[PDB]
Design a protein around this ligand. Sequence first.
Ligand SMILES: *[C@H]1O[C@H](CO)[C@@H](O[C@@H]2O[C@H](CO)[C@@H](O)[C@H](O)[C@H]2O)[C@H](O)[C@H]1F
Length: 300
Amino acid sequence: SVVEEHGQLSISNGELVNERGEQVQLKGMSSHGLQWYGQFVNYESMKWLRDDWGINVFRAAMYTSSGGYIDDPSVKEKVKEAVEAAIDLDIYVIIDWHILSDNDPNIYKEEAKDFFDEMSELYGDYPNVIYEIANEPNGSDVTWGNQIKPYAEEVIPIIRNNDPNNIIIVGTGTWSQDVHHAADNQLADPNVMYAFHFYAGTHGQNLRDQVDYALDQGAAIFVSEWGTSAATGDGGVFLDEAQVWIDFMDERNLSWANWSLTHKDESSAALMPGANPTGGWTEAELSPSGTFVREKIRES
Ligand SMILES: *[C@H]1O[C@H](CO)[C@@H](O[C@@H]2O[C@H](CO)[C@@H](O)[C@H](O)[C@H]2O)[C@H](O)[C@H]1F
């Protein structure tokens, strides 16, 4: 239903629109690292998220380091399973080259180009696919102008050679928070979005003003990772501030993916320890975070 109705996505005047030009907002879940919690990413769990939660996008978080793709590349196959499931369920899917401790996207750029060549050659003629080429650039020595933009200008051409206009989400500086710098020095590709990430444990009023600054420069923004917890993914659940961000994203028509779908014992995890990896969760199998996220997407 979703992908058949909205079809080809694109960016028009800094907004995400469907193939008939109407604004569309995607809301879904991100996996946790596929090298650790890959059992939660399968057709059945994704189908349960779609039908019971109302998700319209799923994000496959393929860590590169921390036991991820560079150490064991077999995890790319789990990305393919998520993509195929999304195609079968007629929802959108984000392929995330999940950099983090490998804080500069240039560290593994050659592997990233090869990876994105393969993914775009395989799925480049489906409208479901959204490429996220560098999850969270971070560090004082990793800037938009010197490291991130140039990386993006190497990897985007590889993708575009196989897939001319599916959406590409590009990470920003300071753990994908520095949308200001990226919005003042935008990429040429017309179907790019800049990532913006937030954690409800952080007081967010200036961060909201910064997203508004970026939007005002005509940059499109995709909230490809956010949590109800602190920045570490644990440390409490902050639903009042999470609700303020939810409302802000609805007012600005910003698409988002919540972190994360796992049973790990950390506040941002959506599931409790005994949740079935294939779905069908009862209220008791959802954590306080997962209960809130599900309500937000159902309400949508
Ligand atoms: C965005 O922020 C989330 C929360 O910090 C990160 O997810 C955390 O990553 C650490 C390091 O891998 C894991 O130990 C935590 O369990 C996990 O919640 C995510 O990687 C980042 F993109």
